Amino acid sequence: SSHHHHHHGSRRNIVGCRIQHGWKEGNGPVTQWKGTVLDQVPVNPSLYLIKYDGFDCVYGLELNKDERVSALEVLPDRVATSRISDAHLADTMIGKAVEHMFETEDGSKDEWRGMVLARAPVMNTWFYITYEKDPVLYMYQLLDDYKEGDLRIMSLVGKQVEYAKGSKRTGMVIHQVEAKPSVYFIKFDDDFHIYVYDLV
């Protein structure tokens, strides 16, 4: 965000780019983060959706405006053009409820009910997914899970929302899932997770 002067500020298009930056929360140390920018929210173009290396959840961050971000560098690395291994499975998987198997410590089975929401932008071979017992936005290469037998297959945008916790968290509806139009992405203030709910 450069003040190309006075009332104007210009901004590089970083959708699809690898980025790295520092992160400082309160009186902690700066931590180092490296991620792939997936999208820029239409109803709030300073808000980006980001997949960070080593974190399964997708995060929503105002990368240019959030004071907690420092030394924001967009990298020259280009995400490799991948073709999806089984396109038919990939396409038919969208919008479907799924049983996604996860291991806990020393191999006890933990099966999570979920819903595949979409093919991820930018990172072609990855899928947007959320879970009944954890309604935030996750990202995984599900065709790997499927081939290993670990995956079994079975507009309000712009509006604000409020959610009761003896508290109230307010948030905004930022995206409608194309495969299932009654399912939306929600970004709450002071939470960088993307929440996923059916708002029927």
Partner: peptide
């Protein structure tokens, strides 16, 4: 199968 991380 995958392992679950934490928030």
């Amino acid at each position: 199968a995958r392992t679950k991380q934490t928030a």
